DNA sequence: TCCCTAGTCTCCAGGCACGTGTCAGATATATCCATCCGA
DNA sequence: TCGGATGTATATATCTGACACGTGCCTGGAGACTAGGGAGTAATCCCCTTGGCGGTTAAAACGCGGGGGACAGCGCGTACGTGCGTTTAAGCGGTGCTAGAGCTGTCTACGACCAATTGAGCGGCCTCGGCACCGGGATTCTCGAT
DNA sequence: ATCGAGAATCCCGGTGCCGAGGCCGCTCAATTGGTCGTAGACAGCTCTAGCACCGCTTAAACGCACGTACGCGCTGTCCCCCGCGTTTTAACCGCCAAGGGGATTA
């Protein structure tokens, strides 16, 4: 299995995402909160992607499955698929 | 040696990450995180590469929007530094985790 | 005008034989049942069109229920649906 | 004879099947779709009504009004997640006063 | 000028139900404007539905569909 | 004359109005407001009373939710009083503006 | 006989026959009117033109002849009504609108 | 299997609007997604209009009403003005 | 390629309009007491 | 920390109008039967995904000033509650009364469907030009100086 | 009240490259032209409920004092987050091997 790869979303990456968001100064406790939020969001999206895959009798998650999972929650990703 | 003030290498890098359009998260750690999360719902999944790319693009757009709302909430509190309370308030007002 | 009033009344008697339901609450329950019906049916129609199927079966309805309802609620709903389907087919 | 009694449900399998046909959802509707849909609807209705009856009993009333339904929906985490963007008319709100506002 | 019919005590009552202990004076104007915008965004769509069915009477079901379109489903009227 | 320290009657009104299901807005003014707003879209649009009641319930619910988020924003800024900037922040974050 | 396609008959660039076929096979309704595909193709063509004009203008502002997703995101987010129409839409490889809060400015 | 797309039509509209402007593959895919999304939104709204009035046909009236519902402000004043411009031409042979 | 579901004919009974007693609930009035404000 | 004074709980009488229970009846659900097509099942191909290794290097982790920003404390003054007398229109009991929402009957255009018919659109394959990188120079902003 | 060294950013031109665009072969989906069943457009009818009015009570809004508490600006501490230099290190690219299953038809 894979053990705690949420650390892979490193502090510089969260800093870069905040900089693109328009953030000038970041506290040191933001990183854990952002990692938790990203884990929650990915869990919700991937659960629906896997549900769509399971209904299609497939074993590989296609890009259209992720697009439809995002469209269900009102994200509507363009370009992919 | 020549040093820039703490509040100017911050402005700088905000203008170039807003000007640029790449991802800003390493691809393999994110793919590995996706597989870690997904193996709790279906063991032995084979994520299509485009699916991982779409997941990454959506996740980063969501986090950037969340950080915009977080910055607005932090500035609203007569502050500049963003704290976890700002993210929690932004999520609560948005509708997530009510 | 067709509504789910008598059926909601029967279910309420089954779960709570000593309580009643007002007309306003009865209309709210009818609108809630219609809302969930349209949600599940629309998601099942989308699932049918996504996979190029031209039919809505218990598989599409089950997947729609798993997509829509939250965790414990969706698990219980799937259990009740499968129980009813197997009971209908066996008899 | 009725399909509802045959499958043990109380919601009408015939009505659900007719609405599935005439709602323009798919070209054809399977025989097992209406029974599953009626079972899911009936389970959800039973959950709402059981929680509403609990709220009414907590309020010492033996009649379910919209306030009891709103209390039941908002006090359940998953029922409130299912109906997050739904307004229960004349249902009120669930009491919540923030701790900062409370006096010393 | 019927927006002034949404009086200061009415907005105060809505704030109290929302759980507000102290209300600034300016809010009683802002809320009105906010309310106005919301009503417009609903009523237009309701009227649009009424325009489609060739009616001159705005039924409650038109309002229900106009609310459902904007993501605020309303239970109790249809 | 007995005098209540400021706030207590406010907290009391909060407890009263979170327990009731009434509408808290006079129905006649709201009907006139709805008719005035609908005058801009079609002249002589009759409104059946059920439609006006539905609009009133929806508007109240929306305003109560907005005031919940406004109170959260005002408490966030280490304040007790809500301000118009709190309403603006709530509306922007929710996505209305 | 002779075929003047319905797109040329109505003066549109978008396909009327394809939109009609997608309306018929999309199970939206039992029957599809004759003018409905023409109307829908006209609306789609107008909206595509409205996106593409602003995208080309933004590409000109970037001194690039080709339209990239960043230009589409700039065109969508800069326009008022198009941003309102696509408020819940993410354009991949589109970046964000350059915006720094005035408080953070030195 | 042959996959359909709105690539040629978007290219025609682009050349009609900007004669000397190209478009990348990613942007073309985004335009295909946008066209499909707006098509599905308008078709769903028109289907709901047909069902609400217990009608069984999708006429240009339903598409006009759906366009007025979805597209905001002036964007719906032009598109409708576009649509009524086209269909009349269609019914003038 | 097979077996499932649309479509049709016949039949009937369950579920919708309609009518009516009556009790759960709203309301008025006195009493009890939980709580807030001041030396 | 008790006393005085408010504003909730609590019990009892007392209407009352929706709730729930019979009754008619009728139309939509059940049961049988028929027919054709959607997809369940099997076999195949390739292609797309996974797994793995070697070499580079941009990026991440760690350590160290150190200055700016979070945070706490104080004083003030003004803006908002709390209450009381005054005004004003909301709410409810009637009335009319008629626009128009909803239901019925023709029958006609209108869309569906099917059998030819062919041209617009897509897949495959060049190819040269816009764009990305790089190397250098000119310009601009910035920070320790005055 | 400027000022110049230093670092970052923009510009200008050269080179390469890869993909956007163009063109041709091959389709099968859009087009024509008929019949044909029928959805609703139109005309008509009937009730019903939405609009308008009036009169009465009275709850509710409102204006005015008035106190007070709290929103806010100012000042001081300290702490923690940012800029920067040094040291890993794992992303990343290129390449290769292999097989699971995602699309296809029958």
State CA E50 to chain mean position distance. Answer: 18
* CATH fold group of domain H1-93: Histone, subunit A (1.10.20)
Contacts of E60 (CB under 8 A, 6+ apart): E77, E78, F48, F50, F51, F53, F54
Among B38, C3, H60, which residue's Cα sits nearest to residue A51?
B38
Which residue places its CA closest to the C1' of nucleotide K6?
Answer: B2
Q: State the CATH number of the domain containing residue A42.
A: 1.10.20.10
Backbone angles phi, psi at D91, to 5 degrees: -105, -15
Distance in angstroms, CA of D66 to C1' of J86? 39
The answer to whether residue B2 is domain-embedded is no
Q: Which residues does chain F have within 8 Å of residue E9's beta carbon, measured at their own beta carbons?
A: none
Contact G43 H83 (CB under 8 A): yes
Helical residues (DSSP H) of chain A, grouped into ranges: 11-21, 30-55, 63-72
Contacts of B12 (CB under 8 A, 6+ apart): none
Rounded to 10°, the helix E27-52/F27-38 angle is 60
Three-state secondary structure call for residue G13: coil
Backbone angles phi, psi at F83, to 5 degrees: -130, 160
Please name the helix (run of DSSP H) or strand (run of DSSP E) that holds residue H58, with its range, or none.
Answer: strand H57-58
Among H88, H10, H84, H85, which residue's Cα sits nearest to residue G13?
H10
Distance in angstroms, CA of A7 to C1' of J102? 66
For residues F27, D68, C9, C31, the Cα torsion angle rounded to the nearest 10 degrees is 50
Contacts of G63 (CB under 8 A, 6+ apart): none
Q: Where are the domains of chain H?
A: 1-93
Backbone angles phi, psi at F74, to 5 degrees: -70, -40
Q: Is the dihedral of CA G28, G30, G32, G33 positive or negative?
A: negative
Give CA–CA dist D75/D63, Å, rounded. Answer: 19
**C-beta of residue D103 within 8 angstroms of C-beta of residue F7:** yes
Looking at chain H, the residues that come just before a C–N gap of over 2.5 A are none
Contacts of G64 (CB under 8 A, 6+ apart): G71
Three-state secondary structure call for residue H46: helix
Number of domains composing chain E: 1
Residues 58-87 of G with CB under 7 A from strand K: 66
Contacts of F89 (CB under 8 A, 6+ apart): B72, B73, B76, F73
Three-state secondary structure call for residue F44: coil
Which residue places its CA closest to the C1' of nucleotide J110?
Answer: G33
Pairing of strands B46-47, A60-61: parallel
Backbone angles phi, psi at E50, to 5 degrees: -60, -35
Question: With a CB-CB cutoff of 8 Å, which residues 34-73 of chain D face chain C?
Answer: 35-50, 52-53, 56-57, 62-66, 68-69
Give CA–CA dist G51/F92, Å, rounded. Answer: 25
Three-state secondary structure call for residue A26: strand
CB-nearest to B78 from F77, F90, F94 is F77
Contacts of B45 (CB under 8 A, 6+ apart): A50, A53, A59, A60, A61, B35, B38, B39
Give CA–CA dist G103/G92, Å, rounded. Answer: 30
Residues paired with residue E57 on neighbouring β-strands, in sequence order? F46
* Total count of residues recorded for chain C: 91
> What is the domain extent for residue G15?
1-106
The answer to whether residue B67 is domain-embedded is yes
Residues 3-62 of D with CB under 7 A from strand I: 4, 12, 21, 28-32, 56, 61-62
**C-beta of residue F64 within 8 angstroms of C-beta of residue E12:** no
Please name the helix (run of DSSP H) or strand (run of DSSP E) that holds residue A77, with its range, or none.
Answer: strand A77-78
**C-beta of residue C55 within 8 angstroms of C-beta of residue D27:** yes
The answer to whether residue B81 is domain-embedded is yes
**C-beta of residue H56 within 8 angstroms of C-beta of residue H38:** no
Residues paired with residue H22 on neighbouring β-strands, in sequence order? G66
Tally DSSP H helices, then E strands, for chain H. 4, 2
Q: Which residues does chain A have within 8 Å of residue C47's beta carbon, measured at their own beta carbons?
A: 55
Asked whether residue B26, judged by its CB, lies under 7 Å from any atom of the DNA or RNA strand K, the reply is: yes
Backbone angles phi, psi at G99, to 5 degrees: -155, 120
Residues 38-57 of F with CB under 7 A from strand K: 46-50
Give CA–CA dist F71/F75, Å, rounded. Answer: 6
Quickly count: other Cβ atoms within 10 Å of residue C8's Cβ: 26
Distance in angstroms, CA of E6 to C1' of J81? 21
Among E5, C5, D62, which residue's Cα sits nearest to residue F30?
E5
Instruction: Name the burial class of residue G76, with classes exposed (0-12), middle (13-18) and buried (19+) by CB atoms within 10 angstroms of its CB.
Output: buried
Give CA–CA dist C8/C21, Å, rounded. Answer: 9
Give CA–CA dist F38/E1, Å, rounded. Answer: 14
> What is the domain extent for residue F23?
8-97
**C-beta of residue D45 within 8 angstroms of C-beta of residue C80:** no
Backbone angles phi, psi at D9, to 5 degrees: -95, 170
Three-state secondary structure call for residue B98: coil
Give CA–CA dist D66/H29, Å, rounded. Answer: 48
Quickly count: other Cβ atoms within 10 Å of residue E60's Cβ: 21
Q: Does A76 touch chain H (CB under 8 A)?
A: yes
Give CA–CA dist A19/E74, Å, rounded. Answer: 40
Quickly count: other Cβ atoms within 10 Å of residue A25's Cβ: 15
CB-nearest to A21 from B7, B28, B71 is B71
Contact G90 A77 (CB under 8 A): yes
Contacts of D77 (CB under 8 A, 6+ apart): none
The beta-strand segments (E) located in G1-106 are 31-32, 66-67, 90-91
Give CA–CA dist D76/G50, Å, rounded. Answer: 46
**C-beta of residue F89 within 8 angstroms of C-beta of residue G101:** no
Helical residues (DSSP H) of chain B, grouped into ranges: 14-19, 27-38, 49-76, 84-94
Q: What is the DSSP letter of G12?
A: -
Number of domains composing chain G: 1
Give CA–CA dist G57/G67, Å, rounded. Answer: 10
The answer to whether residue B12 is domain-embedded is yes
> What is the domain extent for residue A11?
1-80
**C-beta of residue A25 within 8 angstroms of C-beta of residue B81:** yes
Q: CATH number of the domain at C1-91, please?
A: 1.10.20.10
Q: What is the DSSP letter of A21?
A: H
Place of tokens 């040093």: B3
Among C70, G70, F39, which residue's Cα sits nearest to residue H26?
G70
Backbone angles phi, psi at B80, to 5 degrees: -120, -45
Q: Which residues does chain C have within 8 Å of residue G27's beta carbon, measured at their own beta carbons?
A: 45, 49
Give CA–CA dist H69/E39, Å, rounded. Answer: 15
Place of tokens 């009344």: C9
Deposited experimental method: cryo-EM
Backbone angles phi, psi at E73, to 5 degrees: -65, 145
Helical residues (DSSP H) of F1-97, grouped into ranges: 8-19, 27-38, 49-76, 84-94
Nucleotides of I under 7 A from a protein CB: 4-6, 13-17, 24-26, 36-38
Asked whether residue D85, judged by its CB, lies under 7 Å from any atom of the DNA or RNA strand I, the reply is: no
Residues paired with residue F82 on neighbouring β-strands, in sequence order? E23
Please name the helix (run of DSSP H) or strand (run of DSSP E) that holds residue F81, with its range, or none.
Answer: strand F81-82
**C-beta of residue D88 within 8 angstroms of C-beta of residue D73:** yes
Contacts of B63 (CB under 8 A, 6+ apart): A17, A21, A34, A37, A38
Maximal CA-CA distance, chain H:
49
Give CA–CA dist H46/H59, Å, rounded. Answer: 9
Among E58, H44, D5, D63, which residue's Cα sits nearest to residue C18?
D63
Place of tokens 């129905």: F27
Asked whether residue H11, judged by its CB, lies under 7 Å from any atom of the DNA or RNA strand K, the reply is: yes
Q: What is the DSSP letter of B85?
A: H
Instruction: Name the burial class of residue H48, with classes exposed (0-12), middle (13-18) and buried (19+) by CB atoms within 10 angstroms of its CB.
Output: buried
Asked whether residue C58, judged by its CB, lies under 7 Å from any atom of the DNA or RNA strand I, the reply is: no
Give CA–CA dist G85/H53, Å, rounded. Answer: 26
Give CA–CA dist G80/G67, Å, rounded. Answer: 20
Please name the helix (run of DSSP H) or strand (run of DSSP E) that holds residue A61, with its range, or none.
Answer: strand A60-61
F10-E9-F88 Cα angle (round to 5) = 85
- Report DSSP letters for C24-84, one per residue: HHHHHHHHHHHHHHHHHHHHHHHHHHHTT--EE-HHHHHHHHHHHS-HHHHHHHHHHHHHH
**What's the number of CA atoms in the CB half-sphere (13 Å) around residue B87?**
24
């Amino acid at each position: 299995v894979l053990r705690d790869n949420i650390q892979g979303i490193t502090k510089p990456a969260i800093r870069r995402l905040a900089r693109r968001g328009g953030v000038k100064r970041i506290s040191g406790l933001i990183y854990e909160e952002t990692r938790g939020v990203l884990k929650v969001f990915l869990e919700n999206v991937i659960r629906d992607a896997v549900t769509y895959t399971e209904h299609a009798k497939r074993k590989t998650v296609t890009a259209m499955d992720v697009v439809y999972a995002l469209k269900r929650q009102g994200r509507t990703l363009y370009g992919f698929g | 040696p020549h040093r820039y003030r703490p509040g100017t290498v911050a402005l700088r890098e905000i203008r170039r990450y807003q000007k640029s359009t790449e991802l800003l998260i390493r691809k393999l750690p994110f793919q590995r995180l996706v597989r870690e999360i997904a193996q709790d719902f279906k063991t032995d999944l084979r994520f299509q590469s485009s699916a991982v790319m779409a997941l990454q693009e959506a996740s980063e757009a969501y986090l950037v929007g969340l950080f915009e709302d977080t910055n607005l909430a932090a500035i609203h509190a007569k502050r500049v530094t963003i704290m976890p309370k700002d993210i929690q308030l932004a999520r609560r007002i948005r509708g997530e985790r009510a | 005008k067709e509504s789910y009033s008598v059926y909601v009344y029967k279910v309420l008697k089954q779960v709570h034989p000593d309580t009643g339901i007002s007309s306003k609450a009865m209309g709210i329950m009818n609108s809630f049942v219609n809302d969930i019906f349209e949600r599940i049916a629309g998601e099942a129609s989308r699932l049918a069109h996504y996979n190029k199927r031209s039919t809505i079966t218990s598989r599409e309805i089950q997947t729609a229920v798993r997509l829509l309802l939250p965790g414990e609620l969706a698990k219980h709903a799937v259990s009740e649906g499968t129980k009813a389907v197997t009971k209908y087919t066996s008899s | 004879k009725t399909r509802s009694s045959r499958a043990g449900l109380q919601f009408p399998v015939g009505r659900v099947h007719r609405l599935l046909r005439k709602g323009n959802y798919a070209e054809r509707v399977g025989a097992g779709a209406p029974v599953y849909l009626a079972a899911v609807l009936e389970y959800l209705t039973a959950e709402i009504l059981e929680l509403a009856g609990n709220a009414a009993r907590d309020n010492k009333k033996t009649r379910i009004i919209p306030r009891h339904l709103q209390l039941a929906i908002r006090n359940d985490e998953e029922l409130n997640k299912l109906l997050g963007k739904v307004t229960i008319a004349q249902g009120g709100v669930l009491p919540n006063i923030q701790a900062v506002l409370l006096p010393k």
